């Protein structure tokens, strides 16, 4: 499923991401936009053989099991395919573990390179939250 930007913002707020660990809602919407273009089915292979899954492009080396990433952890205790659901609950809860890991949202290359230091709240203007 491809989200609308306000529809995603509403869903992320419902699941408690707004100001989670100090990151306002605009950061999470901006990250999703540049990681996946709001597409829950987005997958991307990495050079080391791991794969990124879902709206926040969560990686199979550490956070989920896809059965083809040898010597990998499953810290969110889910199959990676669960991150492709139009229900974003698993993606959001796993992201809550990731952002608490220590590096914050710098864990997402796209957020750091494309959202950090910008007017992220522009991503929720006009939305009815």
Swiss-Prot record:
BP-aspect Gene Ontology terms: cell wall macromolecule catabolic process; defense response to bacterium; defense response to Gram-negative bacterium; defense response to Gram-positive bacterium; killing of cells of another organism
Catalyses which reaction(s): Hydrolysis of (1->4)-beta-linkages between N-acetylmuramic acid and N-acetyl-D-glucosamine residues in a peptidoglycan and between N-acetyl-D-glucosamine residues in chitodextrins
This protein's record includes keyword Signal: yes
Record GO cellular component, one term: cytoplasm
InterPro entries per record: Glyco_hydro_22, Glyco_hydro_22_CS, Glyco_hydro_22_lys, Lysozyme-like_dom_sf
Subcellular location: Secreted
EC numbers on record: 3.2.1.17
Residues of the active site: 35, 52
EC supergroup of this enzyme: hydrolase
One function term, GO molecular function aspect: identical protein binding
Coiled-coil regions, chain positions: none
Keywords: Allergen, Antimicrobial, Bacteriolytic enzyme, Disulfide bond, Glycosidase, Hydrolase, Secreted, Signal
A Pfam cross-reference name: Lys
Complex and partners: Monomer.
Family per similarity comment: Belongs to the glycosyl hydrolase 22 family.
Free-text function comment from the UniProt entry: Lysozymes have primarily a bacteriolytic function; those in tissues and body fluids are associated with the monocyte-macrophage system and enhance the activity of immunoagents. Has bacteriolytic activity against M.luteus.
Protein name as it appears in the record: Lysozyme C
High-level lineage: Eukaryota, Metazoa, Chordata, Craniata, Vertebrata
């Amino acid at each position: 499923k491809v989200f609308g930007r306000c529809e995603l913002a509403a869903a992320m707020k419902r699941h408690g991401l707004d100001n989670y660990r100090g990151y306002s809602l605009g950061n999470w919407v901006c990250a999703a936009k540049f990681e996946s273009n709001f597409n829950t089915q987005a997958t991307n292979r990495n050079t080391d053989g791991s794969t990124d899954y879902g709206i926040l492009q969560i990686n199979s080396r550490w956070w989920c099991n896809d059965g083809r990433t040898p010597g990998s952890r499953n810290l969110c205790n889910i199959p990676c395919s669960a991150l492709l659901s139009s229900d974003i609950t698993a993606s959001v809860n796993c992201a809550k573990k990731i952002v608490s890991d220590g590096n914050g949202m710098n864990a997402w290359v796209a957020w750091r390179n494309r959202c950090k230091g910008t007017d992220v709240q522009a991503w929720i203007r006009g939305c009815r939250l």
